Amino acid sequence: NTLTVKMNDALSSGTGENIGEITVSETPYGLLFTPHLNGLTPGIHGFHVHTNPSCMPGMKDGKEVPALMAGGHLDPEKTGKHLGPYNDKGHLGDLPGLVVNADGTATYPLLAPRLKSLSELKGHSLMIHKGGDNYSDKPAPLGGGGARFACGVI
């Protein structure tokens, strides 16, 4: 009745350390992402479903990009807007920001009400960014998440 997603650090070199898992469950109000992660910087981290089932690095615009092969934020409706987990006008893959505790662990459960079934996650990937997520494309694109820190294929 649940999915367990192993998350690993993303380097320009390839894949890095395993930093734990995220357990995805179904609730009457949407999918609940319960992290069991370690080794993250305290604070709020951008957290999204990406289109492709890969965490491999790649080259873009002559720049090394960790976990580039995951593609962009999951966007089956082709909205082209990053508007967060509570706005149906943006990427379906926009999840609530990941909450990292003072000791670098992540445990606080995150409800994504726009996702209703675990079947919607199959063939995709989960991404944790270095920066946060203000659920907007301003003042920074894609909520300000920036580089990809960790990634896991579903």
Next chain:
Amino acid sequence: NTLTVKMNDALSSGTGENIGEITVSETPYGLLFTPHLNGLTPGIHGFHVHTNPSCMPGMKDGKEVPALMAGGHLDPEKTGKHLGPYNDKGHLGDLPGLVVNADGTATYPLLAPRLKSLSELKGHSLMIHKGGDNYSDKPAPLGGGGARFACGVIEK
């Protein structure tokens, strides 16, 4: 449309200093609680709607309990169960844990999908607890929230 709740520290004496405000807005997926608070301990704090519109202290077992007049967790369905914001079998007033950043501010928005209209908060109070919230009555009752750190009555 939107509601703004001023929050004040709750003490044996009475009402303490203001710690900021919580802005409640309506979304198609439920009420969104956006805090703007300062001066809390970093970590996750139990965060619940309480039944009665008061933050005044009261006496219980030979002691002045902070914000006791607020009553318990809002529970119109008389479940008597603390099961958190995603479980319809427990207190309706169970909100997601309040996230306090490392610097002691609270800013992360909290969606309570079981609450649909701001009118459901009228005549009640918001409470922030010292402890966290595991959305269960085990191992500790009421999610482990413990004492009442801050409180605010829902006005307008």
